[PDB]
Design an enzyme around this catalytic site. Structure first.
Site, PDB file in Angstrom:
ATOM      1  CG  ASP A 490      13.706 -32.434-107.829  1.00  0.00           C
ATOM      2  OD1 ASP A 490      14.563 -32.962-108.579  1.00  0.00           O
ATOM      3  OD2 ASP A 490      12.877 -33.130-107.181  1.00  0.00           O
TER       4      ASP A 490
HETATM    5  O1  BGC Z   1       8.663 -33.202-108.029  1.00  0.00           O
HETATM    6  C1  BGC Z   1       9.287 -33.227-106.732  1.00  0.00           C
HETATM    7  C2  BGC Z   1       9.827 -31.841-106.360  1.00  0.00           C
HETATM    8  O2  BGC Z   1       8.730 -30.898-106.287  1.00  0.00           O
HETATM    9  C3  BGC Z   1       9.213 -29.554-106.172  1.00  0.00           C
HETATM   10  O3  BGC Z   1       8.139 -28.672-106.487  1.00  0.00           O
HETATM   11  C4  BGC Z   1       9.652 -29.492-104.720  1.00  0.00           C
HETATM   12  O4  BGC Z   1      10.099 -28.185-104.433  1.00  0.00           O
HETATM   13  C5  BGC Z   1      10.797 -30.466-104.470  1.00  0.00           C
HETATM   14  O5  BGC Z   1      11.057 -30.576-103.073  1.00  0.00           O
HETATM   15  C6  BGC Z   1      10.533 -31.868-105.010  1.00  0.00           C
HETATM   16  O6  BGC Z   1      11.810 -32.482-105.156  1.00  0.00           O
HETATM   17  O1  NOJ Z   2      14.948 -30.886-104.682  1.00  0.00           O
HETATM   18  C1  NOJ Z   2      15.634 -31.477-103.557  1.00  0.00           C
HETATM   19  C2  NOJ Z   2      14.947 -32.787-103.170  1.00  0.00           C
HETATM   20  N1  NOJ Z   2      13.527 -32.562-102.983  1.00  0.00           N
HETATM   21  C3  NOJ Z   2      12.712 -33.672-102.526  1.00  0.00           C
HETATM   22  C4  NOJ Z   2      12.874 -34.806-103.539  1.00  0.00           C
HETATM   23  O2  NOJ Z   2      12.205 -35.985-103.074  1.00  0.00           O
HETATM   24  C5  NOJ Z   2      14.341 -35.121-103.808  1.00  0.00           C
HETATM   25  O3  NOJ Z   2      14.442 -36.087-104.860  1.00  0.00           O
HETATM   26  C6  NOJ Z   2      15.091 -33.878-104.216  1.00  0.00           C
HETATM   27  O4  NOJ Z   2      16.443 -34.258-104.341  1.00  0.00           O
END
Ligand code: BGC
Ligand code: NOJ
Ligand code: BGC
Ligand code: NOJ
Lengths: 822, 822
Positions: A490
């Protein structure tokens, strides 16, 4: 350091002090109703959806943490305490908290009174039940008043915590002291209007008093630790009008030495068809039929124990599909109990509600719930089947999808972004896993809407072709997939370039054009495109299958031609077409995701673990050396120390945390499986051990969080707090480790036509047995394992030698004994 | 009765117990930096925008309320206490809180040690300053340690409250024990990336020790009130890394008997330009130049006193423009200080951030900020001028508008709804008020974009024409203005028909079609269209003006035909053309908004106050009998006892609260002014007193909220809590009650060409003098008042009898003496 212990016989984790490094929770219920329950009784409950139908208020980031839950104040001759230690913090002679499967028990003893509470959510019920047992453990008679306490949330948690200008005025309750089985309290805010539902709070006896107004029961200037009413020794019989409605009954008990008394409390969620909303012509009085049925089903201790026995049985059932008996009891407790339990919880919660996930922004993730499926299909396939339909139903016709859906409505939204180009492929991953498990090919024929449009239904399989086509028809100038908003990561936002503070990378507008490509999505496509290909072939779709294979091979050529750095895999090409995760840059030299996943796709694999020339081996050795820590594998190295505008959110985290050099445990199983693929079991087991709950209990003061469940992130080598986890419980790590260990380490995995037995675990597990039920047959798989690298199993089935490692499925009803030699 | 008292000479309200009925706050600052400060140092501070640049965390709905603010832990020989009382709650020998204009003093004394903090925001400074004075009051030498404490917020408060999954890992600080004027701590979260600002907590001395990590400071399992570090007596020198960053310094003091010492603490907001963010090549260390300078300007107590004197002079001379001396001191203190003070606050905050409005969803409301103007234009008109431009820039080309705008960006949004048909005309009200006050006609020529578009600028006056045309071109079948989502009454949603729980009425999809019209908007049109016509006339637009009065005439005729129920004005016509607000119905027979508003616009006025035949007198009596309470007039009667699906949000409140039968103070002054129009001063003045802070101080236990500022709602007759306010501070009540009292009761009100002097206050103020600066002249208005019903003034000016009640404006610098006889 340790704060408690596993009890394998009881399938419990036993906490022996309340002074843990952090609040340690259990998830109660597994169907439609859920409670987050800490070891100090902290947390809350909701029906189906944590944002929209939250029954009780819980404060995240309270001072102290976790003050607010299901409390029972005991007033013994003026002295006030709580068996959950928090909130009163009175001294306890004995304290214990046991988290079990779908239940918890908390016991607290002081000055000759023992108070034991069994919390759980009964099967079929939308309620949380407490069986409270008070025992006089002294030499002399005792009188005490107990005060139950719970704080109502106003349903919409978002509005609850932000919309006081309204919601301070809408709180309503009804109080029924003389109900059919004891005393109940009714929380029915807005039932007057559009809600067809209310909450009940009840006890199985006629209460001495009650209270439904927080301010009265707690008192001006007081915390919960200092509540006025229990200290006063009697209820104030407050009726809320607006402000903060609570549930509270008082019960005076007298016990002779060694005597005990049972109290049964129920917090219930009830609905009425709006025809039957009201008891009266004037619509002022809620109809209480459902509420009385509920309390009547839990009026006695016999009724409770029956439900608890039934729940025990259901777990025993669930856990009977896969299990292992080996020489290593830390492995055993994970595979047999704890990891499968977690999977059930992740299937249920996705990533919405933990003691870190606030149950507000996030609903059911597309990528998230598809991946969870891989660890859930063997447990309850009929429910995985339904969930697949639900996910596919939020897909768009063009093949892309809503990043998530609202659990209450099953309708997708953009609240945490849109245009994650890795999403669409996970649908194929889920369905492949499900078919292999169940063999229920009739699923590919299920008619399934696009974006819930009635009339738009097509066969499930077709949905899959869209996913496959989406990536085919969105490739860049090296033939790698176009990344879009982000991929599995993400935080790799290559189309973003934000300079406006405080607008989120997940929702902020994206730049059209550029040439940003993802090696990850490429790997992803090679793995799942092959699954899709195999399903086209089987549905009789000759040419689609041939076409699908051509594309898969192209994307694989591309990975090796354009996605290879020398000693590892590239992560991506940025907006301008510049390489990401190359040795050329000073930071972010190597990234884990494409190393793990390209190798599972088989890309760059030599002819053995000892072929130092294969890309796959070099990749894993760079990973081993650049990414390895005692606590798992960091995500990339080095972490970025300044803001890299072309990369998005990633360099916004301080080094060693989350996606900027944290151990993102979720991706560790991709390397673990990769290692078994190249035939280095010994090291794959190493990796599994670094991140696994049972192997880390020994460092509970470092890990900080629950020592029985995986977390999403463990602070990495660049972090000052290296080794401390955050965001426990709700993670894909659970299902990916379950896949890793059950299917690749130990080796037992269903395939389309038979069961594969391919142990690859190295010498630390010299021998074990797996009992696997598949397609209604029991497979008893008995393994002798030298763990010599590269060595791969051969099999005999019922006395006869067979070739390769795939045992064709026996008819339902049969037991099939498999002799395994590695 | 009372918890403190007013201090007229000091311009302060003095709270004499920490045990008030609810936390009572002051607002520090009046430019772009602001602090909410309760009488127990609870609250928080932000820059420009409470959602977006919030410096310090604060928890709404905490148990107890208000545990969180700016704290000074005094450790005297092991014994720990706080002079705010909270959080520690030690018995004090003396406590006192003075809320002043732009500052507050809090003093607590315990066992021979008096700590007095003066809080305030300096002029031209983006900081909140504390002058702490610790005085030994024993007859022996004493020693103690002081622990300062503030809790940082992570700038985006919404994110801060919901996104721990991300934000627990991004907390970041710097520690500077030896800076140029003392010790400082730097909160710098996300400065690493897109934020060009950080925060500083510093003290004007070299501290013995510091703490930046909340958990270390407070301790595990502890509340603010049991903070570890103060009790230990030593700081722990924690350096936060993620989690909860705080600012805290320990300073050791020693005082001879009767001796005292000053410490000066500063919470500041700083910004660098991009090319100057970093102290270093590497970009890891914040350029501290701006903060060194700030701390430099508050290095000594003398500099504090000077800035306080300067703030005192700013208030003296904001308050010189309108002043009264009369025989009623409660009326005097409201007019000379408090009502004006409150208007400054509303002008600044709109309805954004109070201890009720959470500073998340609400920004700068189109409707609300236009109305604030009416009460603010006489204080600093240049800034009013800017505000009109800002507001009008969020209007669309069709004359509809964004309902509110984001304070930091000034760009409009739909977060709390769109298409409220009352919105557009408010812009005329504000601009009319500005021009009457200042005579700056050149504002109508200011070029103003539509929804901020480059190239869309028209002169401000054309914006006015778009609003005027919006109503003329959006009338329905009876010739009354179509209502849209709602009018001034946000809960009257006649195009809604909502059955879905959870979804907001403000924010949900409207029904297309139907013939729903508002009588309120009609009364509004008649009033402000009349002012529009006058703006046309002055600009030489006779064909526009002529046509404009035509419509005013048409709409006026339609209120008398189709908007009259028999004894009072009709409220509306629903989607179906059914009357709403009629004696025909069993509930909501009479709604207050049209009654005050219609009559303010002259609709239904007759012979005078005893023309019982006249609709306006018929209407106002109905209001009196059916809506009146000793606490003010309620919005409609009777309240709705069940959900009226076709009216929207209004019937969803329990009877007596908010829009469903609460006293919505904002709309009482419409009725006051209405009564003075018809000529019933006595009743007008009576209605004033029922809702005015000064006149309700004697029933503080019943009002519960700040006794020195108007609240939004007081529970009405049908509520169990009849008399109890909620939503204090941020309310149009302040602007509109200042209009009523300054301009219609006392009767001094700017017009385009002269100062109208038309008292209508009745017999209880027999003589008074108003002092009024208007276009550079000072009018001394001496009033001799019989109070006779219907009786209106005749003036002599500088010795000469004059005709009517308008004094044409004198030159700048003149003093004109007006002797008034009613
Ligand atoms: O929206 C969900 C995402 O938020 C980001 O700001 C976080 O770093 C990620 O871990 C997560 O997957
Ligand atoms: O960004 C890596 C990972 N962060 C946490 C999120 O829940 C997951 O969907 C994502 O793949
Ligand atoms: O959006 C703000 C509006 O919210 C409604 O729910 C309240 O009843 C109104 O008083 C308020 O004006
Ligand atoms: O009727 C709702 C009324 N009160 C709440 C809001 O502040 C205001 O904008 C509105 O006019």
């Amino acid at each position: 350091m340790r704060y408690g212990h596993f009890d394998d016989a009881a399938r419990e984790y036993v906490i022996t002090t309340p002074h843990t490094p952090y609040p340690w929770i259990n998830y109660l219920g597994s169907e439609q109703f859920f409670s987050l329950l800490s070891h100090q009784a902290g947390g809350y409950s909701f029906y189906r959806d944590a944002k929209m139908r939250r029954l009780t208020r819980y404060r995240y980031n309270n001072i102290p943490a976790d003050a607010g839950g299901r409390y029972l104040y005991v007033n013994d001759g003026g002295d006030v305490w709580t068996p959950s230690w928090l909130p009163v913090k009175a001294d306890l002679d004995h304290f214990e908290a046991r988290h079990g499967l779908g239940y918890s028990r908390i016991t607290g003893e002081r000055n000759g009174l023992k108070v034991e509470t069994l919390f759980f959510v009964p099967l079929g019920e939308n309620a949380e039940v407490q069986k409270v047992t008070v025992t006089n453990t002294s030499d002399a008679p005792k009188t005490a008043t107990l005060f139950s306490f719970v704080e109502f949330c106003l349903w919409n948690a978002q509005d609850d915590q932000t919309n006081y200008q309204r919601n301070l005025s809408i709180g309503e309750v009804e109080v029924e002291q003389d109900g059919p089985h004891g005393s109940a309290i009714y929380h029915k805010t807005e039932y007057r209007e559009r809600r067809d539902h209310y909450a009940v709070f009840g006890v199985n006896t006629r209460a001495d008093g009650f209270d439904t107004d927080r301010d009265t029961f707690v008192g001006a200037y007081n915390s919960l630790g200092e509540a006025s009413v229990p200290r006063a020794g009697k209820s104030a019989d407050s009726v809320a009008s607006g402000w903060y409605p609570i549930g509270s009954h008082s019960v005076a008990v007298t016990l002779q030495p060694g005597e005990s008394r049972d109290l049964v409390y129920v917090l219930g969620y009830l609905e009425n068809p709006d025809e039957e909303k009201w008891a009266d012509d004037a619509h002022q009085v809620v109809n209480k039929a459902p509420a009385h049925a509920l309390l009547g089903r839990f009026a006695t201790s016999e009724q409770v124990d029956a439900a608890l026995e039934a729940l025990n049985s259901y777990w025993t059932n669930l856990l009977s599909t896969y299990s292992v008996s080996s020489t290593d009891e830390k492995l055993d407790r994970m595979v047999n109990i704890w990891n499968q339990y977690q999977c059930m919880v992740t299937f249920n919660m996705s990533r919405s509600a933990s003691f870190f996930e606030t149950g507000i922004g996030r609903g059911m993730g597309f990528r998230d719930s598809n991946q969870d499926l891989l660890g859930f299909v063997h447990l309850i396939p009929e429910r995985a089947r339904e969930r697949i339909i639900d996910i596919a139903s939020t897909q768009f016709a063009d093949g892309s999808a809503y990043h998530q859906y609202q659990p209450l409505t099953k309708r997708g939204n953009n609240d945490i972004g849109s245009g994650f180009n890795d999403d669409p492929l996970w649908l194929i991953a889920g369905v492949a896993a499900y078919i292999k498990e169940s063999g229920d090919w009739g699923i590919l024929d299920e008619p399934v809407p696009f974006d819930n449009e009635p009339g738009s239904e097509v066969p499930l399989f077709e949905h899959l072709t869209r996913s496959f086509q989406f990536t085919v028809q969105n490739r860049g100038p090296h033939g790698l997939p176009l990344i879009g908003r982000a991929d599995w990561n993400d935080c790799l936002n290559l189309n973003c370039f934000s300079t406006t503070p405080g607008e989120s990378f997940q929702t902020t507008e994206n730049q059209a054009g550029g040439v940003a490509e993802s090696v990850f999505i490429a790997a992803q496509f090679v793995l799942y495109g092959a699954e899709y290909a195999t399903l086209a072939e089987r549905r009789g779709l000759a040419d689609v299958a041939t076409e699908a294979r051509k594309y898969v091979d192209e994307v694989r050529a591309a990975v090796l031609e354009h996605g290879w750095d020398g000693q590892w895999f590239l992560r991506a090409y940025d907006y301008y077409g510049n390489p990401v995760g190359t040795d050329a840059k000073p930071e972010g030299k190597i990234w884990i995701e494409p190393q793990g996943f390209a190798v599972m796709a088989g890309i760059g694999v030599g002819e053995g673990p000892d072929d130092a020339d294969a890309p796959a081996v070099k990749a894993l050795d760079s990973v081993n050396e650049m990414l390895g820590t005692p606590h798992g594998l960091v995500l990339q190295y080095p972490a970025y120390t300044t803001y890299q505008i072309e990369l998005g959110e990633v360099s916004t985290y301080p080094p060693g945390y989350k996606e900027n050099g944290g151990i993102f445990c979720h991706n560790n199983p991709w390397v673990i499986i990769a290692e078994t693929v190249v035939g280095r079991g010994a090291q794959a087991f190493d990796y599994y051990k670094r991140i696994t709950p049972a192997y880390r209990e020994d460092i509970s003061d470092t890990h900080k969080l629950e020592p029985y469940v995986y977390a999403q992130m463990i602070a990495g080598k660049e972090a000052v707090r290296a080794g401390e986890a955050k965001n426990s419980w709700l993670t894909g790590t659970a299902a990916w480790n379950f896949v890793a260990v059950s299917q690749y380490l130990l080796g037992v995995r269903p395939d389309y036509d038979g069961l594969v037995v391919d142990p690859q675990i190295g010498p630390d597990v010299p021998s074990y047995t797996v009992t696997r039920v598949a397609r209604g047959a029991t497979y008893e798989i008995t393994v002798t394992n030298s763990g010599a690298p590269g060595a791969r199993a051969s099999l005999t089935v019922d006395g006869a030698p067979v070739d390769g490692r795939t045992v064709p499925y026996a008819p339902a009803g049969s037991t099939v004994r498999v002799e395994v030699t590695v």
